[PDB]
Every structure is written in C-alpha cells, then in structure tokens.
Amino acid sequence: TTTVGITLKDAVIMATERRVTMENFIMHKNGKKLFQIDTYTGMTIAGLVGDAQVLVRYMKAELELYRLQRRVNMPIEAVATLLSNMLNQVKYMPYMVQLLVGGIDTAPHVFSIDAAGGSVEDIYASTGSGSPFVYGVLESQYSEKMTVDEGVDLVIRAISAAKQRDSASGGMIDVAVITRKDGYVQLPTDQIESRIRKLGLI
Amino acid sequence: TTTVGITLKDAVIMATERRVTMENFIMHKNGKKLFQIDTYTGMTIAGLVGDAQVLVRYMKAELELYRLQRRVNMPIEAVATLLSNMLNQVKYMPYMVQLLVGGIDTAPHVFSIDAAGGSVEDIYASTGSGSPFVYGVLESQYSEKMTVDEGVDLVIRAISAAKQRDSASGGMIDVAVITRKDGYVQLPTDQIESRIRKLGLI
Amino acid sequence: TTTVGITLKDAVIMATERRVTMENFIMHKNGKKLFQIDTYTGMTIAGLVGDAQVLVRYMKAELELYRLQRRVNMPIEAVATLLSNMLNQVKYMPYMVQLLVGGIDTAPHVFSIDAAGGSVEDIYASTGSGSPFVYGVLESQYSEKMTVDEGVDLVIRAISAAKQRDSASGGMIDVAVITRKDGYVQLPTDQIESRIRKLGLI
Amino acid sequence: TTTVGITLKDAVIMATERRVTMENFIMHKNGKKLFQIDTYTGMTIAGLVGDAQVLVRYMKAELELYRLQRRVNMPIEAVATLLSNMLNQVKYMPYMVQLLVGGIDTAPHVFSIDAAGGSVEDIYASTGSGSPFVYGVLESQYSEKMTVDEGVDLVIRAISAAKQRDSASGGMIDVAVITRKDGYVQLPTDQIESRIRKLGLI
Amino acid sequence: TTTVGITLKDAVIMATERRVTMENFIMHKNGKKLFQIDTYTGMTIAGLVGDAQVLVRYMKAELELYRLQRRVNMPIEAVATLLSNMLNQVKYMPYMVQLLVGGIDTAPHVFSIDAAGGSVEDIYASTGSGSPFVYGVLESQYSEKMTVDEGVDLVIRAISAAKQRDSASGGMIDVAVITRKDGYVQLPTDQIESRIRKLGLI
Amino acid sequence: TTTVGITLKDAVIMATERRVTMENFIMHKNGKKLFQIDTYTGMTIAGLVGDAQVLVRYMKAELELYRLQRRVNMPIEAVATLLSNMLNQVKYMPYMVQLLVGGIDTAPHVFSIDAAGGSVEDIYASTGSGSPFVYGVLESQYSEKMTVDEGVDLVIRAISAAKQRDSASGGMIDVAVITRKDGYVQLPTDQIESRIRKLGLI
Amino acid sequence: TTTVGITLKDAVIMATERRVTMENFIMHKNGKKLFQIDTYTGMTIAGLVGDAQVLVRYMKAELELYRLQRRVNMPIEAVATLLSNMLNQVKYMPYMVQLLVGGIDTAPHVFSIDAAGGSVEDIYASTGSGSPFVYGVLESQYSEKMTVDEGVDLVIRAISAAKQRDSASGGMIDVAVITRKDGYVQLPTDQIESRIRKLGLI
Amino acid sequence: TTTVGITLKDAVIMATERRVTMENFIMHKNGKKLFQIDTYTGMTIAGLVGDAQVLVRYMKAELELYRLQRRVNMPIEAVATLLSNMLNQVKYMPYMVQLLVGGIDTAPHVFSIDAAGGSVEDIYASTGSGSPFVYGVLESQYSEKMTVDEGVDLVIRAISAAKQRDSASGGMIDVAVITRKDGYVQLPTDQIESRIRKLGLI
Amino acid sequence: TTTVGITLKDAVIMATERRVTMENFIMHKNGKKLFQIDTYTGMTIAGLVGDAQVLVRYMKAELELYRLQRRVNMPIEAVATLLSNMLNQVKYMPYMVQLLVGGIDTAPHVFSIDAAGGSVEDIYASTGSGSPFVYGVLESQYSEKMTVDEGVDLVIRAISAAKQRDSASGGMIDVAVITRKDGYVQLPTDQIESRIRKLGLI
Amino acid sequence: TTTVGITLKDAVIMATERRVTMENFIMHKNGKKLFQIDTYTGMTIAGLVGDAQVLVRYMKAELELYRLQRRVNMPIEAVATLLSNMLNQVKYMPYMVQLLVGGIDTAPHVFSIDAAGGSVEDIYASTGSGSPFVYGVLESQYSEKMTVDEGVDLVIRAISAAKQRDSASGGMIDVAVITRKDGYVQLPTDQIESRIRKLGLI
C-alpha cells in the first residue's frame, strides 16, 4: 500500500494506489483506499482492510451528524482529534491502521494518525509499505510554491517510484484535489493516464 | 475447498466442489458450500464448517426480515457491508471463514469478504485452498464479453483444474446462475455432467 | 519467483521471470534464475539466492569434469540423482532451495528436486511462489502434441498469469529451448517481446 | 547507515555517510564505510562494524595476492563470487553484513551481496537503513546517459534525502569515482561541500 | 526526544526539540512536545505520542475546570499530585510516558513524574533519550544564581549537545519562560536562532 | 564505570574512576581501570572485570614482544587492529568489554573498540555507564586548541559530573598524560585533589 | 534506599537517606522517604515511589478521620493492622513496597510491614537495599539503655555505613525523634551535619 | 556462609564460620572453609562445596611445585593472578565460587576473586551470604591502626553479627593470623571461645 | 518455621519457635505463630505471614460471634470444617498456609488443615520446614500415656532438634497447654527456660 | 531410601533399608544399598540405582588395586577424596547420587559426599528421602559414649521411624559394624529381627 497527502498554498492533494493483498497473494488489483468523509475533507487508509473500512463508515456518520447539529463543518484539527481519542481508547485492543486526514477549513491541513492515537500535523506525509520511497521523492522535489498542477504531477511520480520497488503496491493511481472554490474533486482516470504518459512513466 | 464467482454482462455465476474434510480424512464426499440467501443473491463458504453454517443461517434470516420490513431486496453492496460489520465486531474472537457474495440488484456484483471483515468488490474471485489454481485459469481465459454458456464452461474448467492439484478439493461441481429475468437457478447435475464430457474432462 | 519446465516430443522448454527480492523490497528487477549447466542440460532455481548460486557453480564443475573423464555427457537422471545425494547429505543443515533440471540425453526429461533431496520426474513442473498460478494454466492448456512454437507461447502465458497475481514475481521473461539438433538455445528478448505483443499480453 | 553505488557509461560512483551507532547512541560521527580494495575496485559496508572491518581486511589481502600471482587484477564478477563463497560457507554462523562491490575491468560493474552469499549485479544499488529513501530518489531521477558530474550530484542528493529521514544516518558524505583513465579517486571534501551548497542542500 | 526544565530565582524555563519518530523513521521533523496547561503552568511529554497527547487534553480540561470552580489556579504541587493519582490508578495498564510539570504559584517549581505515578520535585530535570547528555551539561554549568537570560542560553546549549549524540532527537528548539510578572511566554523562534548563532552552535 | 580519552595538539589524556561493583554491591572502592600497555600507549577497560584483566595481560605481552622483535613500538592503529582481530575471532563467545586505546606514534590517537571487534578512531571518546554524562560535558566544553593543563581539568570535570548521576561510578579519579617528550606519566593523586578543590568540586 | 527505625526507653527514632533512582540513573538526589502521618506516628517507605506516595496519602487521610471520629489517636498497632489489611487485600495485584511504622501511644513501637501485609513488631528494623549493612551496625552497637542523643548518633552511623556500600543509597540523612513530651520533631539539617563532623564521618 | 579477611600493619587475619548446607537443610554443622595453601598464604571459599574443594587441592599443588622449582614462595599477587587465569579460562563452564586470598610476601595483602576471574586487592573483604552484615560492622569499626589482638576481636564480632541475621551461616568461628615472624597460625578454639565470652557474645 | 500439636489424656499441647524470615534474611527473631482463638481452642500458622495473620483475625471474629449467637463454644471439628470451607472456596487463588487447630470440647482434638482445605484429625501433627525432624522425635518417643509435664518436655525436645537442623527455624520456644479445668494457659518463658536447662539443651 | 552412618569410640555402624522404587511403584522389596568396598571400609548409596551400582564397582576395583600396589589399605579420607575428584570431574554430566563412606584406618570416620563432589566428614550422617526423620532421632538420642550394642539399637530405631513416615523407604534393615579387631561384619538378619522385637518395634 502507498498513500500520500501534501499541502499547497490553498489546496490539499491526496493520492493512493489500488492493490489489496489478501490470502497472501494479489487477490484484488482494484481496491479503494481514498475516501471523501466531508465536504472539504478526505481520508486515506493503510493496514488491516476490515479495521480501516469500519473506521471510514464511523467517520462519515460522525462528521455528517456534527455538520447537521452545529451548522458548520468539523474543523480538520477536530477531525484528527476525534480520531485520536477513538483509537487511543482501545489502544490495547487496537485498530491496526495508519491514517491520513486532509482538508480545508480556513487553511489547508494534513494530519497523520497512528494506531495508538498519536496525531501530528505536517506539510506532507505518506503511509504504507511504499512510503519510504515516497519520502525520498518528496524530500528532493517537493516545494511549497508549487501550483496545483505541479503538485498532482509530483504525487503521481512519487507513487510510481513506490510501485517500482514495493511489491505490496500496484494498480492505477487515484488522486483527489481539495480546494475551497471547487470542493472535493476526484480526478478522472483519463487525466491521470494522460499525465502518466506526459511524465514519461509509460 | 474451491469456490469461484464471476460477473458477466447481466449475470453472476457461482460454483463450488463438494469435498468436506473432517477428522483429517475425507469423511463427506458430498457436502454443500453454495447457498441461495435471497431472491437474487448467492453465497459460498470456505473455512471452518461450523462457523460457515451458522453465518449462512444468520444471513438468510436477516435478508428475509429486511425484505419484509422495507418491501425491497437488500442491495448486494449492503449485504457485503452487513457481513463486514458482523465479522469485524468479533475480529479478536473471529469466524474463521472466507466468503463470496454475488447477486444482481441493478447490475451484477461479486464481493469477497475475509475473516476480519475486509470487503472488496471484484469482477471475479475465488476462495479455498484450490483458489490459486483457479486464478491461473481465470487470468488466461476469462473475458468480460463471454456469454452465460461460455462462463459456465469456464468455471467448470477452472474448478476441474483445482481438483487435479488441491487434495482438499473434490467431488461433483455445483453451479448457480443468477439473472434478473430468471432469478437464482441451480443448474441440474445432468447438464453439469454433460458439459464435463463435452469439454473433454472425462 | 516463478520458474517452469515442460517436455514436448523432442524438446525441453524452461522459463523464469527476473525479480529478486532482497531486504524485503524489490532491490533487483533483472536477476538471473535460469542457467545452462551442460551441453544439453538446464537448471532453474528458487529459494535462497546465495544457496542457489553456490549450487549452480557446483553443478557446472561436476558435469564438466564428468564429461571430460567419461567422454559423454552425464544423463539427465544421473544429474538429478547427484543433486539428490548432495542435498540429502545435509538435510538437517540444508540448502533451502527448490530446483528444476531439464535436458535431453536420448529423450527429453524434466526433474523436480526439493531441499531434502526428493527427486521426481514429470512431464511438466513449476516452482516458486507463482507456481500454483502456473499449474492452473498448464492443467487447462498443456498438450503433449504441441509444437515447440506452441510450447513457448504456453510457458509465456503461464508466467504472465503468475506475474499478475504473485507479488514476489516480475520482470522480463527468459526462455530456453533445448533440442538435440540445436542444443541449448536462449531465446533473444526481441522474440520474447514480439510474442508477448502477439499474444495480447501488452 | 546509507551507502550507494551507481554505474555510468565508463565510470562507477560510490558514496556513503559517516555516522556509526554504538552502545545505542551516536558515539562516532566520523566513521569510514567506503574502502578501496583494488586498483579499480571499491567496497561499501553496512551492518555489524566488527564483521565488516574484518571482511575488508580479508578482501584487501586476497585481491593483492591474486594480482601478484596472476599479473592482472581480479575481475569484478570474480570479486563478488569470492565474497559469495566465503559468506555462504558460514551461512549458519554468518557475517551479519550487507555489501556493495563496484569497479571497472572492461566495463563498469556494481554488485550487491547479502549475508547468505547471494550476489546480484545491478545498474545501481543501495544498502543500510537509509536505502529505501535512496531508491525513491534514484527511481525518479537516475538516467544511464548522465555524465560523471551529474552522477556525483545525484548520489549526493540521494544520501542527503536519507539523512533527513533515517536517524541511523548522518555526517559528511564521502564519494569515490572509479574510471579506467584516472583509477580510484576519492573526491576531496572541499568539492563535496561546494556541491552541497550549489545544490541548495545547505 | 529531549525535554528539560530548570528553576531560577523567580522563573521556570522549559525547552524541547521537535523530532517525532514514527514507523521507525524520521516521519515528522516538526512535532510539538511543550504545552501550556494553565496560566502559569507548563508541561513537557516524552514516550508514546498518543498516550501523551491524551494526557495533555485531560490536564487542560481539569485545570481549567478547577480554576473556574475555585477562583484560583491549581498549585503546581497539586497539579503533580493529580497526575500521580491518575497514572498510578492504571499502573498495570499504564500510560507509557515520562512527564515534566513546571510553573509558579508563590515560588517556581519543577516536578518529574514517571509512568507509575512517582512524583518528585527537583531544581532541574530532563526526560527522553537525550536526557543523560543534558544532565552532564547541567551538572557542570547550572547555577542557581543565573539570570533568566543565562538560563535560556544554558538549556539551549544542553539540548544542542543532546542533538549531537542522541539520534532520536532533532529539529528546532522550543523554549518557554514562566514568570509571575509576564506569565507563560513562548520565545519566538527568531530569538532562539539568534542565540544559537551567538553561542557558536551554528 | 566511567572512562574517557581525549586528544590534544601533541598529547593524549586518559582518565577513569575507581568503583568496582561485585556481588551487586560496592565491594571495592579502589579498583584499577587504566593501564599503561606500551612506552607511549595506554588502555582503559569497561565491562566484565575478569575478561578485561585477561585482555590487559595479553596486550602487555604482545606489545612487548612486538617491540623486541621489530625494534620499534607498535603503531597505535596497529594496536587497535590487533585487538579488533582477537575480539572478532570469538564474537559468538565474546569478551564482554568496551575498550579505549590511546597513545602517540607520530601524532596523538584515541581508538574505541567494542566487544565484536569494531574499531573507530575519534578525537575523544568515553565508555562505561557514566559515559553519556561525559559526552554532554565534552560536547559543550571540549576544544581542540586546549592546552594540556586545560584538558586535564576538562576530563576531571566530566568524570565528576558522571559520578553525581551514575551510581555505578565513584571513587578517586586517576589521570594519565601521554606525550612524546615525557612519555606515559601518571598524575599523582595530590595534584588531582588540588585541581578538584581549585575547580570548586569539593 | 536505606531506612531505619529504633525504639528507646520512651522514644522512637526514624531516619532515611534521600537518593531516588529513576530511569536507571541518579535523577533526584534530594527525595523524601520519611513522613509524619499522625501526631505521634511516623512512616518510612521503600520500593516503588508511586505506590509508596499513594499509600502515604491514604494513611494521612485515614488516621486524621479516625482521630476526628473517635477523639483519640489510632494506636500504633492498629495503624500497622490497618496497613496489613489493605496490602493483603490486593496481594495478587500488590503495592510493591516495604514499610516501617513507628510511634508512641503508651509505649514506643516500631512495626515492619511487607508487600503481602505481613506485620511484625520489633525493637529495631531497617528496609531498602542498604538495610543489611545497617543490621550489621545495629547488631554490634545497639543497646536498649541508650539515651536519645546516643540513638541519633547510632542511626546516623548506620546509614553512613550503608551509603558507603549500597550504590542505590545516598544524599543527606533525615532524622525524626518521636516522644510524648515533645511530639514528632524533625531534626534540622544543621544538627545532622554537626553530628556528622563530630562522629568523624566527614 | 560468612568469610572475612583484613589487613593490618604487618599481619593478615582471616576467619570463617562452619555451617555447610546440603540437601536444603543443615546437614553438617562443622565444615571447613579456611585453608592454608602456602607458608604465608591462606584461602577462604564460598559457593559450591565440590568446586571449592577441588580448587583448594589445585592451589596447594601448584604453590608447592612453584616453591620447589623457584626456591621462593609465590608472591600473593601472583597467587591471585594464577587463580584469575584458571577461572576465566572456563568462564562459560565456571567454578561457581567466590574466593579470598590473603598472605604476606613483603607486605600484607588480601585479594578478592570472583567466578569469572575478576581479581581486586583490598584492605579488607568479605564473601558469602553473610557478607553484607560483615561490611556494616567493618565500615563503622575497622581501623588500619588496630593491633593484631584488636583485629581478631573485630572479625569475631563481625561474623557473630552475620550469624544472627544470615540463616545460611552458623557454627564455631575459625580464625587464622598470618605474620612473617610467626607464619600461618590457626588460633586454637579455646582462645576463640574465651574472646567470645569477654566480648559479651555469650 | 516449626509448629507442633499433640493430644494427651485430657489435654492438648501446642508449641512453636519464633523466627520470621523476610526479605531472604533473619529480619525478626521474635515473631508470633501460636494464637488463642477461643476459650479452649488454639491455632498455629506456617507459610505466608500476611495470609496467616489475616486468617487468624477472621477465625477470632467468627468463633466469638458463634459463641455469642449460640451460647456455646464452637466444637473443634466444626472449627476445622469452617476453615476447610473457606480455604477450598478460593483453592485456585489460595491462602498459601498450613494450619494446626487444637482444643477441647468433650475430648482433646488436633486437626491439620492444608492450603486446599483438606482437614484430617490426628493424635499429633507438625507443620513448617522443621516438621520432618519433629516427626522423627515424636515417632520414637511419643506415648499416649504421658502426663502433661512429660508432654511439655517432649514438644520442647522435638522443636529443639528441628532448630539444630532447619535454618528457617529459631528463637525462643512458646508453649500452650489447654485443659478443661484450667483453660488456655500460655506457659511463661521462665519455666520454658528452666525445662531447657533441666533437659540438657543448654 | 534411608541410609545412616555413625561413629563411636572405636567403631563405625552403617545401616540401610531395602525398598527400590522403579517404574513408579514398589517393584523390588529386597534391594541392596550397603556394600563393603575394602577390608575396613563400607559404602551406602542413594539416588539413581544405575549410577550408584556403577560407582560401587569402580570403587571396589580402585581400592583393591591401591592395596595391592602400595601394600596398605587406602585411608578413609583418601577414599572420600578420590570419590570427590571423580564426581566433580563430570559435575555438568553428573552421577545423580548421594553417598556415605565409613571405615577405620587409625580412627573411625564417616564421610558424606554429594553429586558435585562436595565431601564433608561428620560424626554421623544420613541420606535418602527418609534422612530428615533420622536426623530428628539422632539429634535427641545420639551420644558419643554409646557402646556398639547401644549404637546398633539407635540406628535401628532411627530407620524404623523413617519407614513409618517416608513412603519411599521400607523392607528389612541391614546393619554393618566395622572395627579393627573384627573387621567388616554384616549383622545376620536373625539378630536384627530379635532386636526389633526387643525394642518394641514389632
């Protein structure tokens, strides 16, 4: 698994691959690891599939109820805090997951949350077995001044590098762009493929 | 054990063999591993027999009650989601099973669900100890454009290959075809045998 | 890893992929797992790389010395027997490998040898983590009456199926054809690629 | 620890950092992990310091004796083979090391050798705990057509990325360039520092 | 991790670095380990991030509620006592943390609290893997007669020494100064950097 | 135990304390941990007393024999290399010690050697349970430009700090100064005490 | 840790040292291990700091409540009995402590209580890792006919001997004298120091 | 077991008790633990009886042979060194003993040697389970200026204190006095008893 | 520990020693192990001190309440039965004790009760580590026709023999005599000492 | 098993019972555990039967050879010493036995030797599971002034007491009397039975 989230001037970009290992072989080449959980909030999952899917359902319900009861979206930091409390409360019987939460309330934000409820904000982050390869790409090429279009190309290149070296990763790359003006926009695969050819990644 | 489920244009085909190992020998050559759980929904089971049979009874009751209370059949994705919640809720005291759910609501669907509640949709899937042999056949011969008749021959060939190489599998092959026009139809054994001769599988 | 060897009328075809996992990631995408060890004899290796490479060097030396001392090539069955003795002699401190030996002396032969020195002749065989997917393809499509050209296409399709489902396998496919008339011939990659396009495997 | 070796048109570039952890803290910030072992041959070490230093002394003696007895340098592949035999011979009482051997005999070569004697040639390779970050940089930026000057900048950037993310790595970067025309040349630190400023790595 | 707290005539100085290890690599270089929990009270955390962040939230709520219900701030010793009771109550299912609490009620105070609820007042203290290096600096250079400005330079030098020798520590140094006249004041990074240059620490 | 060795312009300074724990209490307050092993070479020991004392006897004999057979003293680097070979040869049945070797051949040198034979040269080093406290003092106060008199005061202060914080250390401090002009000179305790009063260490 | 309690004609003398080991080093040189828990009752603690401090708070509350409800102080034997019941009630989830209780109701008393609730009265007793050294001093020098002044000198000498031989003990000695005429009197440190000089203990 | 050895101006005094536990009860109340091994050399033993008795026989033979071959007694330090080498040579298959060696060559000496061959000279020392009680007595009462008669009374008092508190010790006290003028003199029991009455030890 | 109880014509004699081992040394030489629990009933304890003391308090309360509610003393057999039920009820979380109950209701009785609640009446019995030595004395010398005075001498001799051979036993012997005419009578120590001299036991 | 040996004025008396447990039941009621190994020397055995019988054969051969080569019997202390060396030499692969050696050379002697070669002389001793009961009898009734006839009655009574309480012991009692005047004399069973009736032991 390889997931990544980066922050730009007024946008958040999140991306994953799609390979789901089960029964110690490549059973599903087209899984889903990136989810929209609020109007301007997204989430990526790594680890046990069953635990992660349950958490996604819980977060969608809680955020929706919050927005109805309080007339505003839950702030991104509060989303991370709520997740941190739930995970820590069962730390000795834990959800074995690693999560990324990203979105926009008044500024872009990306949060990394571990199985024990530790939550840390960062300018960019990556999870899964392919993450170390991603950090190498991000360390040498990431820039805060990048445009949205440059950022999308960057995450695509980072995940492509991970797929070449981490056997647990593979499949088509999914990308989401979150802005206040346009909201949560899932990039259609046709542009993802077009960028892949343009970047020379075959 | 070998079970398989594939999706075609407007149909779902599911199939299993019948050998049930108990007390570390071939006690029952004529078990049942494929069940109809709703009007247009089917289920295959692999793993612990006792756990699987209990799950089959639970699913039949829940789906029947759902259809009475809401006047429509439960959608296939909701069937998988309900199963995922139940399995994950006891993940540390689990049902040691691997399940396939297939059916038609407005399009054909096949879902694979593991013991921890991980649920993934796929165009085709296979479970049990004979599954790797099945995936080899499906990878080289499956086509989305196949007719129903071609698909039935394909799953029969795939399971026959598994029976030649997986000692835990054996016995007569059961096949079910699910369509909106005809519903859940269990193919009579006479046609299964006739196809086996026609395909040269003795 | 995926290796395969099949026997035809008067030929032996052997093939592998090239991915070598080390330090729990895909360090080398272009390894070598298929070796010529005599004029009409070939060998494939699976398991610990270091153990396998040592065994390859030992076999090349022994076979070469045998042919010089006795003026004829060692028969294929004797090659398997020699390997069986060496592996069994250290069965409690073993080479953790699985081997395939194939060649022609007066008829084609393929032998499978395990870490404990068990040696069994077969019409075809496959080793490595991708082998179960290969057996599915071979069970449904192999025929003793195939021409050499048909056999090469068959092993290519079988390995391609394994690469789609076994994360430990990958890379370009190497193929060798052994006949009495032409000897040990390593197919150039240009024909391998050409066949891959012709078979629709991209 | 982070070591790297890459091959270019007619050159080999090898590089390491210098941090040596001992007694579970940063005791030595200025260790040595890159060694010249022959006229046109270099070696990098990762793992247990004591085991690695012993191996370096053995290789220097063997290569020197070889060149005196046979009037030519040992070929790079033979260097890797000799190492593979020694490591495998004690595989159950092993040197816990990971090694890179690079040099020029008639073409550039880089070999990766593990603790069990597995030896694989590659166009580039990296060892140590910082290696996954290096592979990310190399996957996205390496090109076979690079000049020597471009290659030196590449390995410097790759190691700098590893130092930002792997706590076991640190210190000044050492770089060696091997060519037939100039032999084994250890780049003076003054140029290494100058390149670091020029590349914007502070 | 490296945290430190010292007491002067009428002031408390607390300081940490920012490196947060997660997934056994340097994932976050800019974490937060120093928190204001009351008007004149501060807290530093070492150990499991998730456990520590939960404890910080609990302490902020309890102290705020205390001050509202009793019209005065909780005394520093009572803050330590409350923490000691909570940690000891779950000593067999513990928060795996080491904490420092410092502040002013009528005199400066620094308290060290372990995972089992042991609480001891001290003139200065340090926690985390870099703490032994800090104690060496404090033992040779600390003086009770130091001015606030001298104390800030001292803690900066102590943490800088730890960063040179403890790989688990790193990043920018955060410093807080607590006095009755000025309250809890977080030193801006610009002065921290300026002092670092002035002290010759690059 | 606390031992330390530092290098200056043309001198080496080595120092230890004297507490020897045996039978889990402070049995001997006046042990010996610093030894002269050659005309211009010294050695400090930490770890198992019996193993260390045997090693000291071996080194004295080997160095003495070397100097008689070759008419010159063994170079310091060769002393470290000889030790490294002996320790590594029994790495699986090891001397559980940590050693420091220092001396002058044509320049001052200090070497740190671990139980597995890893040997690293450094400008200064410290061993034993009190070493982390020493590194804090050295990191903040050591300077290469110090005179011999300044260096002696520095090591005395460093060891005094360790004695305040490491219960395994204690007793009177022994100091040796090695120069080419004066040779190995053990400072009399009267000057050590006088410096301790002058430095305000009581 | 070293604590001691002795009985004289009409007085009880209790004394401890102050060293508190935490994180396996001498973190706090000035801890508190001797507490007044009633008008004429004292308590010393050894073992886990957190467990001991909780017990001290419980005993202060219970004794205070007892004296208010029944108009008289709890007798010393009843104090020991109450402690014995509480410790034994959780014997399988125990407070890992060793306690001494001393005081005057109508005669002097000293009680020793272990972690399992065993309570035994004695003329004198000692706890902690330094206790065996104390018993040697008491066995050879204690006399029931000693004056209070002689007894204070005796406990000071006993603890000083323990500090010379038990590394877990250290720091300034605290002494309390309990009589009916004067109550619980904590000796000021100035007299403790003066006695230490007078007894020749430096 | 309790053994002790002390040094005076020109004498060595050694003493033990006599209780030998075997089969987990007091089988022999009159064992022997103090032995003369040379003209002016004595030895005490603690630990496994069988191992200790074998060592005593070895030392008597070696010292006797040494004195015959070299015409002088082995120096006490050489006696300790010889013992240290023998014990360390079998450190992983060890004699489980603790030894004291004392005697006069040109000055009095006492050496303590552990099971791993660690040897340390001291002014006084004590071994066995009763040793901590002995150290308490020695710390408070030993003086270098004592006469021989005072020293004998001191060791008798120290061992008597151990017998009151260590259940593994008991029986009559044996005492030996070693001087150059009088040699090795075993005090007759009649004086030992007489001193015991005179000292008030019943 | 050594306890004993014997029955005579119309009397019960019970006796113990007083040594209480704690912290693996002889901490208390004057413990109490024999208790009166009713007008004509006594009890001895062996094993864990804390468990035994709690049991003694429970038995005193229950017997006292029984006698008040039913106007007669609880019969000795009922005392044993009540104890048996309480111990067995927690057999898997047990009081680790061995008990003796003796007394007179209409005839003398002695009962032995183990940790699991097994209760057996006997003419005489002994518990503790010194018990086997006691049984040897009782087997050869006990007689049912002995007078009370003879019985007291017998138990004194039996316990004295145990003290000579069991290191866990020691101290002054306590003796109680129970008759209907005189009730529970604790023999004063002056007669115990007088008998000890008269019997030649020093 | 129960064996015993006692010393009188000019005689040694040894005695055993005869029960040999094998296969966890009373297979042989009439074993032999007392052996004459020299003219005036006897031996008793406890522990593993096979180990003990081998040792008896070795001792008979060695003593016989000694007496032939040196014209005198081996002294009893030398017999014990020889045994001690043999047992200790295999202490880590030991004879699991406990032995008693008794005899007359110029005075009576009894030696006790354990499995590790520990050898201690005593006036009397006892081995086996029944030994603690024997020590109780001997402690209360043994006297050095007893005649031979009194001693024989004493050992008979001691063993009879052990047989009443140790289930591992039983059968007829064998007794041997060793004197210089009469040599090794095995008492005929008829007198043993006669004494048993006379002593009232049925």
UniProtKB/Swiss-Prot annotation, chains A, B, C, D, E, F, G, H, I, J:
Keyword annotations of the record: Autocatalytic cleavage, Cytoplasm, Hydrolase, Protease, Proteasome, Threonine protease, Zymogen
Location(s) in or outside the cell: Cytoplasm
CDD domains reported in the protein's UniProt record: proteasome_beta_archeal (cd03764)
Recorded superkingdom: Archaea
Annotated GO CC locations: cytoplasm; proteasome core complex, beta-subunit complex
Biological processes, Gene Ontology terms: proteasomal protein catabolic process
Signal peptide (UniProt feature, chain positions): none
Gene Ontology MF terms: endopeptidase activity; threonine-type endopeptidase activity
Main location: cytoplasm
Annotated active site: 1
EC annotation from Swiss-Prot or TrEMBL: 3.4.25.1
Record's keyword annotation contains Acetylation: no
Activity control, per UniProt: The formation of the proteasomal ATPase PAN-20S proteasome complex, via the docking of the C-termini of PAN into the intersubunit pockets in the alpha-rings, triggers opening of the gate for substrate entry. Interconversion between the open-gate and close-gate conformations leads to a dynamic regulation of the 20S proteasome proteolysis activity.
Catalysed conversion reaction: Cleavage of peptide bonds with very broad specificity
Family named by the database record: Belongs to the peptidase T1B family.
PANTHER family documented for this protein: ATP-DEPENDENT PROTEASE SUBUNIT HSLV, METALLOPROTEASE TLDD
Other remarks in the entry: The configuration of the closed gate contains an opening large enough to allow rapid entry of tetrapeptides but able to impede the entry of proteins and longer peptides.
HAMAP family linked to this entry: Proteasome_B_A
Subunit structure: The 20S proteasome core is composed of 14 alpha and 14 beta subunits that assemble into four stacked heptameric rings, resulting in a barrel-shaped structure. The two inner rings, each composed of seven catalytic beta subunits, are sandwiched by two outer rings, each composed of seven alpha subunits. The catalytic chamber with the active sites is on the inside of the barrel. Has a gated structure, the ends of the cylinder being occluded by the N-termini of the alpha-subunits. Is capped at one or both ends by the proteasome regulatory ATPase, PAN.
Function: Component of the proteasome core, a large protease complex with broad specificity involved in protein degradation. The T.acidophilum proteasome is able to cleave oligopeptides after Tyr, Leu, Phe, and to a lesser extent after Glu and Arg. Thus, displays chymotrypsin-like activity and low level of caspase-like and trypsin-like activities.
Protein name (record): Proteasome subunit beta
Species this chain originates from: Thermoplasma acidophilum (strain ATCC 25905 / DSM 1728 / JCM 9062 / NBRC 15155 / AMRC-C165)
Record lineage: Archaea, Methanobacteriati, Thermoplasmatota, Thermoplasmata, Thermoplasmatales
Gene it is expressed from: psmB
